[PDB]
Amino acid sequence: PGSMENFQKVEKIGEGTYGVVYKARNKLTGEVVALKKIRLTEGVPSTAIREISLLKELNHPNIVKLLDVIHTENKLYLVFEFLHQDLKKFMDASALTGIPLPLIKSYLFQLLQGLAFCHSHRVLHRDLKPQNLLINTEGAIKLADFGLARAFGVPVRTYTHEVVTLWYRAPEILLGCKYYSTAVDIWSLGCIFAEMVTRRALFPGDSEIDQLFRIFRTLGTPDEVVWPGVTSMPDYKPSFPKWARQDFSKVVPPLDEDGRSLLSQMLHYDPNKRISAKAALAHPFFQDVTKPVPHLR
């Protein structure tokens, strides 16, 4: 549909799965886009195969639009819609103010919309973290970076185990569970929810065991009551320290009762009881939601 001649390269934005991402401008329409470039040894990489084929179908205001794919010589270009910043950069710009609660709520609700859409279209994101969530100047936030994404079936099969950036990885993955589903993404959004509130990662582990022990130290070490089957999971160990669940009000102290209710249902140990994106949308936490623009440039 397009060609590289009509794009003016503006500046390096970032560095993704295929190397650099570049901000560019379509000289004919004036549209500003992001270009991922994939130098085409093992043929087109499976990551791009999935990113392009899954994004083609996922047209939603809270998923970044794949605009085009241009196949030039020995090269493949992905043209996305341009979003000014990611959420990580904005959390860091928000250090002295915090993110205002209207924005935390707007952003979470939007994330949940985007993810429910993914799940309704049999896609797992499997790498939700602030760095992969894009914000524009109009107040939108959007799920980006679908290179670790996968089209699932019902019920699910065993998929890749090396999934989700460690800080955001669900316990059923850390425990080497044969099967994982849409709850792994909800877990990620839970971590991100807490992170918007405090501007710091909820479980910043240094290794898989460290990650699991930080989770356990916050939500308590799971037992058969909280999470039936846990003591039989492949990477469960009986010698795991048994930490007590802490007042959940103490996990995100400024959050009020509704925020706490919702957050707790996102970080439920048992993936069967963890709230779905679809059900989260109706949580009382969002009763007054709006979509304001970011309070900072």
């Binding site: 085409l40 093992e42 043929g43 087109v44 990489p45 499976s46 195969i49 999935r50 392009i52 084929s53 899954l54 083609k56 179908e57 794919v69 196949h71 799940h119 309704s120 279209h121 049999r122 089209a151 699932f152 079936g153 019902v154 019920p155 699910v156 099969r157 065993t158 998929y159 890749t160 099967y179 589903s181 849409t182 709850a183 993936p271 069967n272 963890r274 779905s276 679809k278 059900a279």
Partner: protein
């Protein structure tokens, strides 16, 4: 629980029913193919089955590959000498889509007995991606089957294995199977497996889910039952062989029923 996505299964099924229409090959593409035939394609699909067995690939990868081939063959004329290149690129793309650990390109070159170069496979790969406009997330008989199985009361692995076996058999024979959508073949295969093994029939539950009745399924059932009865004598044997394996509870060894006893329910 969450592994069977209670909150999304219905949405997922509606979506695959719409995407199966969009990913549907042309029923009459072989007539417009000057140099290839149903038999040629049958040999190719039969070979991919063995490739899948050799590399211990998913059944889903196999079904994706056949989908790509048929859609490709719908718009692109192919000489008999290059049908296998089409299929290899297809299977390579399927694998990269669907597999945790896809085989290497080199592996794919080797299974073509050095008929084609690695440069040829990677070029075909690109060609296939352009013809399909990268629409690779196509629904399969499997995606429907696995959903249907959730309605078994109780669950029964011979039923499950027998259904996949029948669903796979249909891949081999463009005539008649191009006529039918995935969701319909899965339904016919599911019923036929259930009937063969337990004596039972398409459940009201799947009537509610799919809107298909035994009446709806009859034309596909008549065909699929014949393929089962003739399976031993088919020129292609790779699927029956595959399904002799304990992994699939040896279902290819089960005897097909002689009759289907498909009847009309009066005022239901």
């Amino acid at each position: 629980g969450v592994n069977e996505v209670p909150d999304y299964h219905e949405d997922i099924h509606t979506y695959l029913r719409e995407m199966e229409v969009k990913c549907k090959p042309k029923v009459g593409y072989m007539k417009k193919q000057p140099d290839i035939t149903n038999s040629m394609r049958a040999i190719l699909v039969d070979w991919l089955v063995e490739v899948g067995e050799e590399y211990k690939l998913q059944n889903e990868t196999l079904h994706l590959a056949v989908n790509y081939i048929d859609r490709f063959l719908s718009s692109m004329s192919v000489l008999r000498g290059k049908l296998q290149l089409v299929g290899t690129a297809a299977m390579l793309l399927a694998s990269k889509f669907e597999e945790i650990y896809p085989p290497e390109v080199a592996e794919f070159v080797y299974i073509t007995d050095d008929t084609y170069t690695k440069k040829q496979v990677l070029r075909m790969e690109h060609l296939v991606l352009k013809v399909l406009a990268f629409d690779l997330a196509a629904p399969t008989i499997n995606q429907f089957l696995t959903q249907y199985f959730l309605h078994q009361q109780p669950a029964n692995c011979k039923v499950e294995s027998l259904a996949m076996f029948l669903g796979e058999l249909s891949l081999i024979d463009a005539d008649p199977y191009l006529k039918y959508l995935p969701s319909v073949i899965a339904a016919a295969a599911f019923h036929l497996a259930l009937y063969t093994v337990t004596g039972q029939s398409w459940p009201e539950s799947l009537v509610q889910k799919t809107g298909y009745t035994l009446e709806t399924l009859k034309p596909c059932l008549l065909d699929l039952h014949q393929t089962y009865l003739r399976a031993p004598q088919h020129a292609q044997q790779s699927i029956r062989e595959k399904y002799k394996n304990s992994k699939y509870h040896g279902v290819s060894l089960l005897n097909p029923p002689e009759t289907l006893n498909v009847h009309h329910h009066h005022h239901h």
